[PDB]
Design a protein around this ligand. Structure first.
Ligand SMILES: [K+]
Ligand SMILES: [K+]
Ligand SMILES: [Mg+2]
Ligand SMILES: [Mg+2]
Length: 135
RNA sequence: ACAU
DNA sequence: CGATGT
């Protein structure tokens, strides 16, 4: 119903899918960019969406912040809930980097706790998530 | 079908 | 138009 403005919003951007993947997190209210991941040469949209949420969790925990995270990705929200990213991307030399990051994000989820609500951004009602790349 |  | 996902 109502946007929770006191929140962090995340989104992925890519050049190709699979292709070059980046992501960022912003203050939902103001749009201030709070973190941005260096582009990863080959990944999928959903791996990026998942890494963005997990980085948001780590960012908020380190800062003792109870803010929720918004993501527009049905898939990534579920992968985080499950602590398991069920990507189809082949494992090879060119995908080694993103798969290492995905593996390590799952490992972090499996070794830490958090109460952070992970909320679905309702794009149909509210427009594009505030972290969107505008691509 | 829904979400990207 | 194509791809990633539940
Ligand atoms: K975009
Ligand atoms: K589809
Ligand atoms: Mg998105
Ligand atoms: Mg977007």
């Amino acid at each position: 119903e109502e946007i929770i403005w006191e929140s962090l919003s995340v989104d992925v951007g890519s050049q190709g899918n699979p292709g070059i993947v980046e992501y960022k997190g912003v203050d939902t209210k103001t749009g201030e960019v709070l973190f941005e991941r260096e582009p990863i040469p080959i990944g999928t949209n959903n791996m990026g969406e998942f890494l963005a949420i997990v980085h948001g969790l780590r960012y908020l925990k380190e800062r003792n912040s109870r803010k929720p995270i918004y993501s527009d990705s049905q898939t990534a929200i579920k992968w985080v809930k499950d602590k398991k990213a069920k990507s189809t991307l082949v494992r090879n030399e060119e995908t080694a980097l993103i798969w290492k990051l995905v593996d390590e994000a799952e490992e972090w989820l499996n070794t830490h706790t958090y109460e952070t609500p992970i909320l679905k951004w309702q794009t149909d009602k509210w427009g594009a998530i505030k972290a969107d790349y505008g691509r």
